[PDB]
């Protein structure tokens, strides 16, 4: 027998590479190549591990880079680090009316201005100051850019393939009987949320529970719903915006008086739908534990204002809703209104050095969205208590990128055959 | 859940002899040594691996669910309490005698 050479063979290996984008905004879109064909590979089984997937870290650092790049050409609010004079506005005690001296377009003259500040944004030293005046430097977000998520497709370079798992009952790890090949993923809207996943993708078969190793209580548990749970969030206040000339060609946007009465912002969720989704979750979670065990629920134990409350962005404004009423039940074997708070000084991505100011939005803010998953923490130590937890944004992306994996294509092979070269 | 057992409660070993203590547990197992009045120190972190700076005489072997801690050339300062731990759960250790 004699060895031969084949240049086209279906062979793949595990490797990590740079994935590019295919599709103003904070995440730069229209800088992505405009965008299909999907091939089903038959009689192939491959192993997927979503807890060491590399496509999560790359997308995390890409989104961080996009945020930093988009905040660069905007106004710096360094002259706003000043001693304010705040007074009560007459949701009692939440708003403040603060007056202060500010610089003007002439270097040797000043002006006296005022603005409406939330209670969560000021601290005392009658004299108040911003929260970040001792830890961080604050920059204003440009009003042109929009915070609304837009789907982004991640595509592999030439010579590289993306394999996805089409198994409906697939958990976090293990072989996938039904495999397929694409070169660009589905639209993945970048949404930030700490306790409830919003605008996600549903499960076709049923609720699914995935953790790295469920015996370890230090690992979060990801729950994926099969039907959405509609939630309606609103800010009833009618806001008015102002402009202040703080330098040569530099404007700071302040809030004017609220037109009409002042009411609390909130969110509504349906009681029956949530009382059925909790039952399905309890059953699928009782699969792992003993049938005699009883499943409790409780609200978060403690932490930051970002992990104790469900935090999100509703049309350019930041909400921190209290979800103590959702997670209060015990299972053995009308609507729910969630009060929310609003903050303007936003420090995110778990950095302690770079703050950001969100300009006020005039009008009434309304959001209608789905709830497509939960992130929980089981307490350790015949009953189990599960409390919502979050704060790390890589779980949010693991929830979406569990199917896909990236493979090198190696097309050279030397097989035996019965022929010789003349 | 986690089922755990420590059979060699009290042991009487002489200097220079080799002894073993059996810990039965589910999951990753750690061997710790704690002198009386002092904070525990890590000896074996996975049940068969050794920690940096520990004497080479200490070693461990895992056979099925059973775990064994083996030492050779016992020293006068080598007599203390030794316990196995798994995640949050731990059982009181074994005290040897001179």
């Amino acid at each position, epitope marked *: 027998l004699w060895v031969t050479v084949y240049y086209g063979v279906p062979v793949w290996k595990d490797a990590e590479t740079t994935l590019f984008c295919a599709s103003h905004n904070v995440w730069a879109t229209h800088a992505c190549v405009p965008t299909p064909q999907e091939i089903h590979l038959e009689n192939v089984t491959e192993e997927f591990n979503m807890w060491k997937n590399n496509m999560v870290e790359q997308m995390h650092t890409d989104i961080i880079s996009l945020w930093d790049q988009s905040l660069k050409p905007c106004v710096k609010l360094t002259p706003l680090c000043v001693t304010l004079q705040c007074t009560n506005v007459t949701m009692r005690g939440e708003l403040k009316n603060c007056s202060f001296n500010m610089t003007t377009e002439l270097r040797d003259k000043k002006q006296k201005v005022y603005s409406l500040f939330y209670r969560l944004d000021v601290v005392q030293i009658k004299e108040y100051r911003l929260i970040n005046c001792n830890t961080s430097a604050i920059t204003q977000a440009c009003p042109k850019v929009s915070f609304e998520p837009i789907p982004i497709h991640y595509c592999a370079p030439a010579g590289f393939a993306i394999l996805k798992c089409k198994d409906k009952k697939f958990n976090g790890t293990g072989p996938c009987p039904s495999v397929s090949t694409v070169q660009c993923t589905h639209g993945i809207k970048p949404v930030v949320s700490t306790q409830l996943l919003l605008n996600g993708s549903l499960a076709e078969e049923e609720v699914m529970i995935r953790s790295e190793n469920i015996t370890n209580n230090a690992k979060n548990i990801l729950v994926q719903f099969n039907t959405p749970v509609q939630i309606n969030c609103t800010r009833p206040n009618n806001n008015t915006r102002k402009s202040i000339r703080i330098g040569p060609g530099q404007a700071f946007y302040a809030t004017g008086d609220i037109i009409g009465d002042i009411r609390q912002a909130h969110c509504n969720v349906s009681k029956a739908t949530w009382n059925e989704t909790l039952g399905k979750v309890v059953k699928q979670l009782r699969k792992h534990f003993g049938n005699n065990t009883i499943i409790r629920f409780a609200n978060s134990s403690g932490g930051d204002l970002e992990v104790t409350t469900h935090s999100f962005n509703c049309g350019g404004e930041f909400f921190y809703c209290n979800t103590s009423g959702l997670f209060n039940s015990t299972w053995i074997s009308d609507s729910i209104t969630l009060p929310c708070r609003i903050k303007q000084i936003i420090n995110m991505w778990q950095r302690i050095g770079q703050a950001m100011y969100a300009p006020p939005i005039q009008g009434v803010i309304r959001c209608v969205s789905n709830i497509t998953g939960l992130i929980l923490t089981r307490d350790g130590g015949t009953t189990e208590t599960f409390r919502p937890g979050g704060g790390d944004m890589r779980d949010n992306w693991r929830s979406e990128l569990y199917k896909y994996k990236v493979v090198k294509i190696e097309p050279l092979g030397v097989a035996p055959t019965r022929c010789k070269r003349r | 859940d986690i089922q755990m057992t420590q059979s060699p409660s009290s042991l009487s070993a002489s200097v220079g002899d080799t002894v073993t203590i059996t810990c039965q547990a589910n999951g990753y197992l750690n061997w710790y040594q704690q002198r009386r009045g002092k904070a525990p120190k890590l000896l074996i972190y996975d049940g068969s691996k050794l920690e940096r700076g520990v004497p080479s005489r200490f070693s461990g072997r895992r056979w099925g669910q059973e775990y064994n801690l083996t030492i050779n050339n016992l020293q006068p300062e080598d007599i203390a309490t030794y316990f196995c731990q798994v995640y*949050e759960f731990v059982v009181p250790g074994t005290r040897l005698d001179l």
Partner: nanobody
Amino acid sequence: VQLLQSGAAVTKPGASVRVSCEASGYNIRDYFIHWWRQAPGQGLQWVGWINPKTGQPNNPRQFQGRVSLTRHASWFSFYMDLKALRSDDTAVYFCARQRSDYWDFDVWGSGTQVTV
């Protein structure tokens, strides 16, 4: 990578106590910190962990409602609280530094011996 612990304290039942615990040695945000308490002549008992990045605590059913854990970053000191004490809460408390998925602790504090 060394953990400094505060001194001992004696208090009456139905009081509050604080046991500061500070880490100065390493990159602190990347590792959890656990608390253990032991009674005289008995094995260790788990009390719970705290996440340095977000401050999320975790406690067993017996201790929940009585103990709260808090951290205070500086431009890292970990605390512990006990709202309601009792005769049997006299123990010794240790800080531990988890560093892997095996829950192996390689650094411990000197310990605080609290009597009631």
